[PDB]
Design a protein around this nucleic acid. Sequence first.
DNA 1: GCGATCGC
DNA 2: GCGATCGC
Length: 58
Amino acid sequence: SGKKPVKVKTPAGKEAELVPEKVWALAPKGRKGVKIGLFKDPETGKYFRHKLPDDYPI
DNA sequence: GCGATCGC
DNA sequence: GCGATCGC
């Protein structure tokens, strides 16, 4: 689980600051990849994945 | 296509 | 079992 909030655009189309429920690195062998957060849209109650900043702690 | 994750 | 998440 994550700690600090993340500047996120929701599926519903709104800018929100949300603390991700799970975070992990998504990277192939030999390449940097990205960090991924699993988020819950507070309005709709639905889950979605979003890129995390590069320095976000896993 | 690779990489991990999980709600659906 | 997969969509969808990014950047290479």
